Amino acid sequence: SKILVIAEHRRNDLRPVSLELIGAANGLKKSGEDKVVVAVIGSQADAFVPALSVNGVDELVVVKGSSIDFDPDVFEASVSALIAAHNPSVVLLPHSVDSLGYASSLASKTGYGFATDVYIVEYQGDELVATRGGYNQKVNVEVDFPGKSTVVLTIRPSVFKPLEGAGSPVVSNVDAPSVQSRSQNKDYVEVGGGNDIDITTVDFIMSIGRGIGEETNVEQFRELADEAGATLCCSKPIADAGWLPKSRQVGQSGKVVGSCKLYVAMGISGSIQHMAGMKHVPTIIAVNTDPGASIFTIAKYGIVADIFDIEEELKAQLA
Amino acid sequence: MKILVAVKQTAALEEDFEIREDGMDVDEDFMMYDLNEWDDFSLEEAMKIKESSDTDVEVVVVSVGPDRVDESLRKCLAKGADRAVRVWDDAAEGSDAIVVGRILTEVIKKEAPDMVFAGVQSSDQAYASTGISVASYLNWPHAAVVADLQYKPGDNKAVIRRELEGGMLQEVEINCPAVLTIQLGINKPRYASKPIEEVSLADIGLSANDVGAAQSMSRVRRMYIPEKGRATMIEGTISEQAAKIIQIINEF
Numbered sequence: 001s002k003i004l005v006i007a008e009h010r011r012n013d014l015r016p017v018s019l020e021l022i023g024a025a026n027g028l029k030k031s032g033e034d035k036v037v038v039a040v041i042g043s044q045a046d047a048f049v050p051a052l053s054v055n056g057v058d059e060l061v062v063v064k065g066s067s068i069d070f071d072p073d074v075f076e077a078s079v080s081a082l083i084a085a086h087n088p089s090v091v092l093l094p095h096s097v098d099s100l101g102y103a104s105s106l107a108s109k110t111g112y113g114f115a116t117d118v119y120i121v122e123y124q125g126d127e128l129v130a131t132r133g134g135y136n137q138k139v140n141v142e143v144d145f146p147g148k149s150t151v152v153l154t155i156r157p158s159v160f161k162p163l164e165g166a167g168s169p170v171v172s173n174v175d176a177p178s179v180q181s182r183s184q185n186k187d188y189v190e191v192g193g194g195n196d197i198d199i200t201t202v203d204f205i206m207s208i209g210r211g212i213g214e215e216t217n218v219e220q221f222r223e224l225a226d227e228a229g230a231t232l233c234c235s236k237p238i239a240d241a242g243w244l245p246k247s248r249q250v251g252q253s254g255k256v257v258g259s260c261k262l263y264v265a266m267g268i269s270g271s272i273q274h275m276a277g278m279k280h281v282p283t284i285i286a287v288n289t290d291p292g293a294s295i296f297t298i299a300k301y302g303i304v305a306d307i308f309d310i311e312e313e314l315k316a317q318l319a
Numbered sequence: 320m321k322i323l324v325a326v327k328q329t330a331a332l333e334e335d336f337e338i339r340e341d342g343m344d345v346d347e348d349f350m351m352y353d354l355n356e357w358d359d360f361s362l363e364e365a366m367k368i369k370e371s372s373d374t375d376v377e378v379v380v381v382s383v384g385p386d387r388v389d390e391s392l393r394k395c396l397a398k399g400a401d402r403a404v405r406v407w408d409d410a411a412e413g414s415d416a417i418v419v420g421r422i423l424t425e426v427i428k429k430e431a432p433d434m435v436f437a438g439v440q441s442s443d444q445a446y447a448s449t450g451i452s453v454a455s456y457l458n459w460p461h462a463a464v465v466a467d468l469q470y471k472p473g474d475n476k477a478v479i480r481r482e483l484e485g486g487m488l489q490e491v492e493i494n495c496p497a498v499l500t501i502q503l504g505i506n507k508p509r510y511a512s513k514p515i516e517e518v519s520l521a522d523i524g525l526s527a528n529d530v531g532a533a534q535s536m537s538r539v540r541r542m543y544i545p546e547k548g549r550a551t552m553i554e555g556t557i558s559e560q561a562a563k564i565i566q567i568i569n570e571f
C-alpha cells in the first residue's frame with residue numbers, strides 16, 4: 001500500500017512539518033513493502049527535492065502548478081490527481097493554514113475518509129484509527145473510516161517526530177491539472193506594530209492573556225515584567241485588540257519562543273495554537289483561576305489564583 | 320446584495336463532566352451552549368459591509384442544529400442580522416463537518432447570496448472544515464483564515480489577507496462570490512459579551528439518507544477523557560504562591 005504525504009513550503013523554504021508527516025507515514029505503514037510517496041506542489045518546487053530526499057521517502061513527486069506557493073484550487077486539483085495516480089490508502093496533510101484552504105473541499109467531492117487535527121494514528125489490523133480532540137481539547141475522540149479505501153487526515157503539527165538522515169527516493173515530475181484558479185496570490189505582508197524586541201531570542205517571558213480583562217490592566221504586568229527582568233508577551237487576543245504589538249504574540253500565528261527557558265502564563269487558557277509557540281519551554285508556570293484550563297496539562301507549576309492578586313504580591317515581594 | 324453567514328452554537332463543558340454510558344459523547348447535562356466565538360467576528364464583518372454600503376445588504380444567519388440554537392440566532396438578529404434560518408431534523412444528529420457542509424449548501428443554493436462567511440473553526444470540535452466543505456459543494460472560490468477583507472458589495476473580486484503561521488499575512492485577490500472563513504481579530508465586534516425561519520430537511524430536498532452519522536466521513540468509536548499532563552499545583556495563600564514563583568525565578 002501507499003501513504004501519500006503532501007509537503008509544505010512557503011517563501012522558498014520547506015516547512016518542517018513536512019518531515020513530521022513523513023515520520024508519521026513511516027510509523028503508520030503495515031509492512032516494509034509499503035511505500036511513502038511525498039508530493040511537493042509549486043511552480044518552482046524542484047528547488048525542494050534535496051530537502052525532501054530524506055529518510056522514509058520512497059517516491060518524491062514534484063508537481064508543477066500555476067502558483068509559486070499555496071493556492072487552494074491548484075492544490076485541490078493536484079492532490080486529487082496524486083490520489084488518482086497513486087491509489088494511496090492514507091493521505092497525510094499538515095493541519096496548517098494552507099491545508100485549511102482545501103483539505104475539506106477535497107474530502108467533500110469524493111467521500112474519502114476524512115479527519116482533521118489528528119494527533120494519534122495507528123492501524124489496528126487493517127483498520128485505520130485516528131484520534132483527535134473534542135470539546136475544546138477536553139476529550140479524545142477516536143474515529144475510524146469504515147469502508148473507505150482512501151482516508152485523508154490532517155495532522156497536528158509538532159506531534160510526530162521526523163526521521164533522521166538522507167534518503168534516495170525515485171523523483172518524478174508531473175504537471176498539475178490545468179485549472180484556472182479563482183484566486184491570485186499577491187504580497188506577503190508583515191503588518192505594522194512596534195518591534196523593539198525579538199521574542200524568539202529571549203529566555204524569560206511573562207505572557208498575558210484574555211484573563212487580564214481590560215487594556216488598563218496591561219500596564220501593571222508590563223511593570224511586573226520590568227521588575228522581574230522578563231519580556232512581556234501575550235496571547236493572540238491581546239495582540240488582536242491592539243493592546244500589545246503583534247511582535248509580542250506567542251503561538252502558531254505569532255512567534256515560537258525558542259530561546260525561552262521560563263515562561264509565566266497569566267490568564268492564558270492554553271489553546272493548541274498558543275501552546276504551539278511555547279510548549280517546548282522547560283519551565284512553564286501557569287496562573288489561571290480555571291483548573292480545567294488546558295495550560296495546566298503542560299505547565300510544570302500551576303497556581304490556581306487571581307492573576308491581579310498574584311501580580312501585586314509578586315511586585316511587592318520583588319521590590 | 321446578500322451576505323450569508325453560517326453560524327454554529329457551540330458547547331463548552333462544565334467541571335466534572337462525564338462521558339455518556341455508550342461512550343460516544345459527553346453527557347449533555349454538562350454542556351453550556353453559546354455562539355461560536357469565530358461567528359461574532361464573521362457576523363461583525365458582514366455588518367461592517369452592510370454599514371459601509373449605500374446599497375442594501377441583507378445579512379442572513381443560518382445554522383444547522385436543534386432547537387436550542389434559536390437562542391443564538393435571536394441574538395444575531397438583535398445584533399442587526401436581517402434574517403435567521405435554522406435547519407434541522409433529528410435525522411441530522413451526528414452530521415460531521417462535510418455533511419453539515421452539504422446541508423448548508425442546500426440553503427445557500429436557495430438564498431443565492433453574494434458572499435458566504437463561515438468561522439475558521441468551532442471552539443468545541445475545531446474541525447476547521449465546515450466552511451470550506453460548503454465552498455466545495457457550491458463550487459465557489461474560497462479562502463480560509465481571513466484576517467482582512469477589502470470588498471465592496473457588487474464587486475466581482477475582493478482582496479483578503481490570510482493569517483499565516485509565524486507572524487505573516489498573505490494578500491490574495493479572490494473572485495466573488497466566494498466562501499471565506501473568518502479569523503479572530505479581523506474586527507472588534509461591538510456587542511462583545513423578526514422570527515427565526517425554521518427549515519426541515521424536506522424543505523431543502525434532503526432525507527435521513529443524506530445526513531447524520533451514517534453519511535459522515537468518519538465514525539466515532541469512542542470519546543474519552545485522556546490522561547493528560549499534570550502540573551505541580553502550588554497551594555496556599557497568595558503570599559506563598561508568589562513566594563514559590565520567585566523561588567522558581569531565582570532558580571532560573
Ligand SMILES: Cc1cc2nc3c(=O)[nH]c(=O)nc-3n(C[C@H](O)[C@H](O)[C@H](O)COP(=O)(O)OP(=O)(O)OC[C@H]3O[C@@H](n4cnc5c(N)ncnc54)[C@H](O)[C@@H]3O)c2cc1C
Binds near residue numbers: 212255277464
Ligand atoms: C489558525 C489559528 C491561529 C491561532 N494562533 C494563535 C497564536 O498565535 N497565539 C495564541 O495565543 N492563540 C492563537 N490562536 C487563537 C486561539 O484559538 C485562542 O483564541 C487564544 O489562544 C485564546 O487566548 P487566551 O488564552 O488569552 O484567552 P482564553 O482562552 O479566553 O483564556 C482566558 C483565560 O484566563 C483565565 N482567567 C480569567 N480571569 C482570570 C483571573 N482573574 N485570574 C487568572 N486567570 C483568569 C480563564 O480561566 C481563561 O483560562 C489561533 C487560532 C487559530 C484557529
Ligand SMILES: Nc1ncnc2c1ncn2[C@@H]1O[C@H](COP(=O)(O)O)[C@@H](O)[C@H]1O
Binds near residue numbers: 325384423
Ligand atoms: N451546524 C452548523 N451550522 C452552521 N454553520 C456551521 C455549523 N457547524 C459549523 N459551522 C460553520 O463552520 C464554523 C466552524 O468550523 P468547523 O470547526 O469546521 O465546524 C462556524 O463558525 C460556522 O461558520
